[PDB]
Design a protein around this ligand. Structure first.
Ligand SMILES: c1ccc2c(c1)Cc1ccccc1-2
Ligand SMILES: c1ccc2c(c1)Cc1ccccc1-2
Ligand code: FES
Ligand code: FES
Ligand code: FES
Ligand code: FES
Ligand code: FES
Ligand SMILES: [Fe+2]
Ligand SMILES: [Fe+2]
Ligand SMILES: [Fe+2]
Lengths: 385, 111, 388, 383, 103
């Protein structure tokens, strides 16, 4: 229960989603890139409100909760790995094994009855496409594919990316990237011209509700998402008018991009093709706590050899990353933050006045509320009563 | 055109709602309150929700999106956050058949 | 109720006043000077907790709530006034008319069923004496005169002032100013010596609980306030003693000022005469939110012709503003701030121990409790709630 | 109370202690050193959440609450002492006597009926061993000796120290200090190496639970404390092992110290001898507000004349202070801060998983709960 | 292999009795109605003595942090307890209570 009951009782269509301000438990989440964590160099990170520790032992990644069982201090305050397979708390030397979190020794009293009887929480970790995924959940984890958008795990798909921390709840990030009409904020994008792309100001829906989106619940890989089909039966708006007078126009170009966009649990958007007819963008909105998230953005592009990478790698650092990920998506970041106040007291979930193009967002909320694997609460974070 | 045939009066149990699709125009909602029938636009004025997909309690329809509500007879807001009144459409039963007006009540030639 | 009922039950004599933490709704409040808002240049501001936007179109001012009806973002994050009479949200392009706040266009979906069927909140705006007043209220506004002190609107009254944001609830500022004994903090003010003023360390009560205090609720323009007739019924304390010994004296200048002070709803103090025998000071303590207010200072001087008006403006800039509005009132600023902690959890209103000099303030609290036009609440800010 | 009732109900063994977030009222507490406050120079401070003013008049100390009875402003915003025996509020001039807090005048209304009928709260103040102690309580105070560790007030005991504000609740400081196993954090101490001290990594307990500590429910002066006796029947651990292989060792110094450790209400630790055979360390963890405390450190050494005292003063400033009070105890400071988050929501008092050496801490919590002289509450702070 | 706890007459319904053992961890004997159960005396969540806790039916509440265990199964009954309590063989041989090793 992370939200006032009176509010959850009003949004009968997607209460679980409104309540999930701390994110969905029992899902995988990219937290960093493999190149960021070397052998024997523990890194700290907060995910779904839980402080965690990640270490690489014999090339393999391990995840232990960053909070001693004794007096609850963060082990990372002073890292003490005395053996390849363990970590010793700097306070009273309680020692845990990275592979199962078991308390195997206590240097301050090797005769303690606690030894071998206590266990520190651990979480599954899997590397893929140069990305580190942590299963923030309990029990046996599902295939990493279930929480990845289609085409991310392709053998030839060269996945390159960037990562940073953004000051907004994760949901606001999701509903901004999957908002068909938010493209208006990009209307002055230099990338659009510097890649002569075609981008309308918005869209005039066509057809009925159902046709506006494609809800996925039959994928065998387990995925759960929604495709935004506003562009099929809808006429793009390239000329903005106020009182019959035209005051703004979209951008013209031969390059037809983003003619396919989908949002998938636990919170990753797929815009294909983008930022080029050959490339693709995959971006996660990872919940760190109730007010921040990791903006994990990547760019996929098929290849088949060294030369099909070094040139790309050169492109990424040269134009793409700076133009598409930063220069273009930076407009999304401050738009994301502009919605914080309205939803901060949870009142926005009841007072928002939606219009046609929000049909997609609504589908997403219903999907997420129905197929999320669990709601993260303060009980999971501090003291599970 | 002027009057749209909805269905047989018997087809609707009291306290239920029926959505009336219209080519070229926004959908309507027909409510059966007891033995009487009323009709309003189907789309909640607060957003894009379908009132026919909401909860009907008495002559007040509750929207499924944010909990707003309207009086089905007058079309006026009954619960926040709704503030804009719903357009109301006249309904008449003939031969036990339910008919709903093609145009909403106009703030024209009335009390 | 913005305050715990357990506290309100202990201040039954003036509960509404103590509950009015965000100020009083349905009143005119000055927020800036006319010269500060130019044609086609939208300015932002927060009043009674509400973010607002003011624009000047064809010389006339308009006020729109700075919160889009769509996703609740502030329009001011990136102002987009595409046509003279409208403003377009930078996010999804919902467009509103400044005149009535009606959503008239939507660049991202010209066929939306929302167009013409939604309205953004607007508030009446009026300019008088070079000041910009906003009626933070609902429905047709009353005449500005009701919410202004006497003489402020006189035709020959030339008005010049200063405005700034101070970190204290608005009521602490009201009670700092309408306090006859607080001038003790001003005993070393440059204005006192430099303008040869006669100023006691404090004005003590003299008559009775009815003669020095004068409650006004029978005014023709409908203004409601309280006078503390310090000059004609109060006792000037020029010699401060401790154990019978004189440790401090007031100022024995020749200029007679501060004959009477009065506080008026919604919260404007009038000091007359001040800071000179031929002038008057009018100052507003405008609620921005529960922790801050605008200290809107103005000095009035009757001018009979252009020469006099020109001379007054020069002396305001070179003397009155720096020596009086800043040199004298700057001490009021930290004093107001010093009271914050005591009243932060509303307990101060129950724990304060008042003395005889505070009878005027008490009369004001009761008048404010009775004649205010509405208590502003957090509900008015986020949106009023209601179920059937 | 100061803590959620659901939590206080769970800790039946020491609810008052857990509730004592602001500290214990009706006890003496050191707040500064005598030489830090001069004649006629008022000093401000906050103790147990209350803003206080201390002044020295004719050599004697006086303490008034730093809050005007009129509008509740701090008198210290602009100190106005217009006569030797009074302080006048800078706002409306209510004037108070330092000796009894009585409102004796009001410059702005000399005939007010309030004069002589109102009193500002005053607290007893006493100076001993060059330290300033304030009795944060009501009514006549007990002897200072009741709230000080044994020997602190001995005639020949020469006291020198340092004080600072640390960011953690006072209790976390106390527990860290009396924690037998925390010495693990001092294993790389410069002091231990250079002063050649014996310092194990911890202790393997021996004997029964009752033998682990020695509770003192009453010194003749009324003291309440607990001695840590883990070393009486326990085995000191000098080699740390993981999976059977050695990974660390303790310090094998020849000098044996800290064989006598005790904690006393209201919250002062005594380590004897330390940091050297002929010295003792006494340290207070004085509550300022719920998130901070004064870490009042003192080192004592018996001196029989002006020569030894001068010699001590010298060694203190050049060695003990930098090597012990700072070099050694600095590790204790970040250790304390590291526990804040776990206990900040009060959840840590339920979820903590204790082990054998924590018997010392448990005994202190029960003693503190049973013999404290009162729980300071927010109501005492606001009125 | 059993040891004398006390006569069943000594323990009243709903009470607890601590059993000290030589060179061994202490045990706690609970009397629920006329049934007798035994478990380790030390709480698995810390170092508390459960024999100083509060018996509510068949559930024993730790006096330290409010944890609790089902005295029959020795399984946790309330957080923060999560580690099962060792249960020991208990039996009565003519008005005399007796406890043995861990079952
Ligand atoms: C007596 C009481 C109040 C005041 C003055 C005198 C001057 C003055 C100037 C500005 C505001 C208040 C006051
Ligand atoms: C051994 C055990 C504990 C301690 C010391 C030695 C010194 C010292 C100083 C301050 C607090 C504890 C201790
Ligand atoms: S807090 Fe980690 S061992 Fe004590
Ligand atoms: S869409 Fe109906 S209450 Fe908001
Ligand atoms: S938030 Fe203003 S148009 Fe969408
Ligand atoms: S606040 Fe101190 S005299 Fe008024
Ligand atoms: S020691 Fe038993 S509940 Fe913690
Ligand atoms: Fe975007
Ligand atoms: Fe003033
Ligand atoms: Fe220490």
């Amino acid at each position: 229960a992370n939200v006032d009951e009176a509010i959850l009782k009003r949004v009968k269509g997607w209460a679980p989603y409104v309540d999930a301000k701390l994110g969905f438990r029992n899902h995988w989440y990219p937290v960093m890139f493999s190149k960021e964590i070397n052998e024997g160099e523990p890194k700290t990170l907060k995910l779904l409100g839980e402080n965690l520790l990640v270490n690489r032992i014999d090339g393999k990644l391990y995840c232990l909760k960053d909070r001693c069982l004794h007096r609850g201090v963060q082990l990372s305050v002073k890292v003490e790995c005395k053996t390849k397979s363990t970590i010793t708390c700097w306070y009273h030397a309680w020692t845990y094994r990275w592979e199962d979190g078991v308390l195997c020794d206590i240097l301050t009293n090797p005769t303690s009855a606690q030894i071998g009887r206590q266990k520190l929480k651990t979480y599954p970790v899997q590397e893929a496409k140069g990305c580190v995924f942590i299963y923030l959940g309990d029990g046996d984890p599902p295939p990493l594919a279930r929480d990845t958008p289609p085409n991310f795990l392709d053998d030839d798909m060269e996945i390159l990316g960037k990562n940073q921390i953004i000051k907004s709840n994760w949901r606001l990030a999701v509903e901004n990237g999957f908002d068909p009409s938010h493209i208006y904020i990009h209307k002055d994008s230099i990338l659009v011209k510097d890649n002569d792309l075609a981008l309308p100001l918005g869209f005039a829906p066509g057809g009925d509700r159902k046709q506006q989106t494609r809800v996925v619940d039959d994928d065998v890989v387990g995925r759960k998402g929604v495709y935004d089909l506003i562009g099929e039966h809808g006429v793009p708006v390239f000329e903005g008018t106020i009182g019959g007078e035209v005051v703004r126009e979209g951008a013209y170009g031969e390059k037809i991009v983003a003619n396919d966009i989908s949002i998938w649990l636990p919170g990753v958007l797929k815009v294909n093709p983008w930022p080029n007819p050959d490339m693709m963008q995959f971006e996660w909105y990872v919940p760190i706590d109730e007010n921040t998230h990791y903006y994990f953005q990547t760019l996929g592009k098929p290849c088949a050899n060294d030369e099909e990478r070094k040139k790309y790698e050169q492109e990424f650092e040269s134009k793409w990353k700076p133009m598409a990920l930063e220069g273009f998506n930076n407009d999304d970041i401050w738009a994301r933050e502009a919605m914080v106040d309205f939803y901060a007291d949870d009142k926005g979930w009841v007072n928002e006045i939606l219009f046609e193009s929000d049909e997609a967002i609504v589908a997403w909320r219903k999907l997420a509320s129905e197929h999320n694997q669990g709601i993260q609460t303060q009980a999971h974070v501090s003291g599970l009563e | 055109q002027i009057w749209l045939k909805v269905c047989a009066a018997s087809d609707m149990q009291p306290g239920t709602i029926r959505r009336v699709n219209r080519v070229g125009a926004a959908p309507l909602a027909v409510y059966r309150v007891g033995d009487q029938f009323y009709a309003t636009e189907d789309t909640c004025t607060h957003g894009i929700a379908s009132l026919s997909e909401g909860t009907l309690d008495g002559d007040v329809i509750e929207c499924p999106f944010h909990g707003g509500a309207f009086n089905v007879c007058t079309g006026m807001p009954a619960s926040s956050p709704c503030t804009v009144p719903l357009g109301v459409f006249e309904v008449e039963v003939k031969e036990g058949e339910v008919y709903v007006a093609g145009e909403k009540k106009l703030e024209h030639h009335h009390h």
